[PDB]
Amino acid sequence: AMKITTWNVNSLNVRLPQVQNLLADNPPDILVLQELKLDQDKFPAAALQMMGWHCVWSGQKTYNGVAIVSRSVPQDVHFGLPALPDDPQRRVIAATVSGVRVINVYCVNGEALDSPKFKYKEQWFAALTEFVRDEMTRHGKLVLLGDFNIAPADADCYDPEKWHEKIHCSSVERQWFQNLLDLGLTDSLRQVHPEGAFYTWFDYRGAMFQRKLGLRIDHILVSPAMAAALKDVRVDLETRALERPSDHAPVTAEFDW
């Protein structure tokens, strides 16, 4: 049995009490975080270590930031993407926890399709694809998870016509997501729930969460051996409903052996 959770916290300094409540009440074996928004030396390691968790993280000031939190020691920690060595943005950290290779990604948002950040998103997803491909030659049990900032299909967007060829929903972004699936990875939540709306992000503006209008952009992609052990995937909307929430909801995948 194994329980893994991904959560974009949108600044861990703000969301730390909710992260700790998440770890005490129904704990996962592994919790990965995105957008820590704090430098390498500002991570709250002591607060999480005192509760019995091992922490590895990659941080920078103000932006980005990724972390892996587990009860067992995370081994062979890799930082970044080898095909993109000069990129200072801290978006990728990978470690092996209990025989499972965990790759935590805070994928590039892109801002808009005509934004220079969209070409950066293009290069970045190309660099990510080569990294996961090389990693998958070594680890039969592998999980690529995090904030992909890509809604895979129209069932993952509350208004597909309004979002036609818009950021997160464009057909080229959906090809990049498909390029990751073509490595042998499974959209774990669509294997459990082939149909229905399972949005993970709700815009802060216009009370979009109360209207239940959002996107599914936080995913858990698993290798064939992990897919055969998959039993459930859920989106935790209770946490999204808390006072002063993150705009993302946590996603938890459960495996058995």
Partner DNA sequence: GGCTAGCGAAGCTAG
The residues annotated with a catalytic role in the active site are 106, 147, 248
84 is an interface residue for DNA by CB under 7 A: no
Of 63, 123, 130, 155, which one interacts with DNA (CB under 7 A)?
A: 63
165 is an interface residue for DNA by CB under 7 A: no
Q: Which strands form 186-187's sheet, in the order they lie side by side?
A: 75-79, 92-97, 100-106, 142-147, 218-222, 186-187
Distance of CA 241 to the CA centre of its chain: 19
Stretch that binds DNA, among 60-68, 79-87, 132-140, 183-191 (CB under 7 A): 60-68
The half-sphere exposure of 111 on its side-chain side, counting CA atoms within 13 A, is 7
Non-local (6+) Cβ contacts of 174 within 8 A are 150, 151, 152, 153
Nearer to DNA, 13 or 40 (CB): 13
User: Dihedral (C-alpha) 30, 245, 207, 158: value to the nearest 10 degrees?
Assistant: -10
Give the gyration radius of the chain's Cα atoms. 17
Q: Which residues ranging from 7 to 36 are in contact with DNA (CB under 7 A)?
A: 10-11, 13-14, 35
241 is an interface residue for DNA by CB under 7 A: no
CB atoms within 10 A of CB 117: 16
Binding site as annotated, residues for Mg(2+): 8, 10, 35, 147, 149, 247-248
Size of the site for DNA (CB under 7 A): 20
In degrees and rounded to multiples of 5, residue 55 shows phi and psi of: -135, 130
Nearer to DNA, 126 or 183 (CB): 126
Least Å distance, CB 244 to DNA, is: 5
Helix (H) or strand (E) holding 81: none
> Binding string, 185-224, against DNA, x = CB under 7 A?
------------------xxxx-x----------------
108 is an interface residue for DNA by CB under 7 A: yes
Report how far residue 150's alpha carbon sits from residue 179's, in angstroms, rounded to the nearest whole number: 12
Of 18, 23, 32, 37, which one interacts with DNA (CB under 7 A)?
A: 37
Of 117, 133, 193, 234, which one interacts with DNA (CB under 7 A)?
A: 117
Residues that bind DNA (CB under 7 A): 10-11, 13-14, 35, 37, 61-63, 108-109, 111, 117, 203-206, 208, 244, 247
